[PDB]
Amino acid sequence: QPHKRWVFTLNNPSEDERKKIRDLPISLFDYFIVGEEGNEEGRTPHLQGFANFVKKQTFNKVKWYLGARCHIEKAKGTDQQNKEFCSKEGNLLMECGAPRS
DNA sequence: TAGTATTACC
Ligand SMILES: [Mn+2]
């Protein structure tokens, strides 16, 4: 049930929610990336994220760390694929660690 | 899994 690797989307993040995530300790993660997306024409600003935790984490622990309003899923793709997907719009909020095999 | 949404990796 608890799982090491999760993606997340957070739609219309507020400055508070961005700070919560910004302020996460980097010791929590083997790899973590968060991109700001959805800022272009007629479209929803959101965080596009991926977390590879040091330890496996339950669904509700992940929501505690990242925020109540996040949509989260067990990651099916590799760290590298997620790194590319969450970097695709060119405005990264944070990235720490390195992608893992 | 719940929450926010059409954004969400393979
Ligand atoms: Mn996106």
Walk me through the structure.
The structure is a monomer. Helices cover 25% and strands 40% of the residues. With 101 residues, it is α+β, with helices and mostly antiparallel strands. Strand 2 and strand 3 form a beta hairpin. The chain has one domain. The chain has helices spanning 15-22, 59-66, 79-87, and strands at residues 3-11, 29-37, 46-57, 71-74, 92-97. It is built from 3 helices and 5 strands. Strands 4-1-3-2-5 form a 5-stranded antiparallel β-sheet. Manganese (II) ion is lined by residues 37-38, 46, 48. Manganese (II) ion (MN) binds at residues 37-38, 46, 48. The protein binds one DNA strand of 10 nucleotides through strand 1, strand 3, helix 2, strand 4 and helix 3. Belongs to the nanoviruses/circoviruses replication-associated protein family. It is found in: Host nucleus.
For this entry, give a set of tags.
monomer, 101 residues, alpha+beta, DNA-binding
Which strand order do you get reading across the main beta sheet?
Answer: 4-1-3-2-5
Q: Assess the beta-strand content as a share of residues.
A: 35-45%
How many β strands by DSSP? 5
Based on helices, strands and strand pairing, what is the structural class? alpha+beta
Cα-atom Rg, whole angstroms? 13 Å
Order of helices and strands: EHEEHEHE
- Oligomer category: monomer
Determine the fraction of residues in helical runs and give it as a percent range.
10-25%
Q: Name the ligand types.
A: manganese (II) ion
Q: Terminal Cα separation, in Å?
A: 21 Å
**Main sheet, how many strands, which sense, barrel?**
5 strands, antiparallel
Structure annotation, total helices? 3
